[PDB]
């Protein structure tokens, strides 16, 4: 298993108001330029949220949600500072509850 860090918000906020996939795209391009393995992803309606270890987060989460996920904690620290209205946390994967850290429930 590896540890995944996440910032979770509503689709309203992260897909429409502040389409964060814009910032992710420029980060992906810069990673490419530097020959760096991409270690961050946007996941819409993430399946990880149904894991028992994340019950507290699911209990507070928007009905229609989306996560920025990374194996680099630093990045998620900055995503939280950048967006602020996001829940944050971490999980280990793959596991029984989270067989695919990047899977969507849609």
Write the topology of this structure:
Layout: E1 2-10, H1 11-17, H2 21-33, E2 40-44, H3 55-60, E3 65-70, H4 73-83, E4 87-93
Antiparallel strand pairs: 1-3, 1-4, 2-3
What does this structure look like?
- With 106 residues, the protein is α+β, with helices and mostly antiparallel strands.
- The protein contains four helices and four strands; from the N terminus they run E-H-H-E-H-E-H-E.
- The two termini are 24 Å apart.
- The relative contact order is 0.31.
Secondary structural class: alpha+beta
Tell me the number of strands: 4
Number of domains: 1
C-alpha Rg (nearest Å): 13 Å
Specify the biggest β-sheet: 4 strands, antiparallel
What is the third-level CATH name, the topology?
Alpha-Beta Plaits
CATH first level: Alpha Beta
Binned strand content? 25-35%
**Superfamily (CATH H level) name:** Uncharacterised protein family Ycf54
CATH architectural arrangement = 2-Layer Sandwich
Report the helical percentage.
25-40%
Distance between the termini: 24 Å
Please trace the helix and strand order, writing H or E for each element.
EHHEHEHE
Please report the number of helical segments.
Answer: 4
Shape, please? globular
Arrangement of strands in the largest sheet: 2-3-1-4
Keywords:
monomer; alpha+beta; Alpha-Beta Plaits; 4-stranded antiparallel beta sheet; 4 strands; globular; Ycf54-like protein; photosynthesis; Mg protoporphyrin IX monomethylester cyclase component. Ycf54 domain PFAM
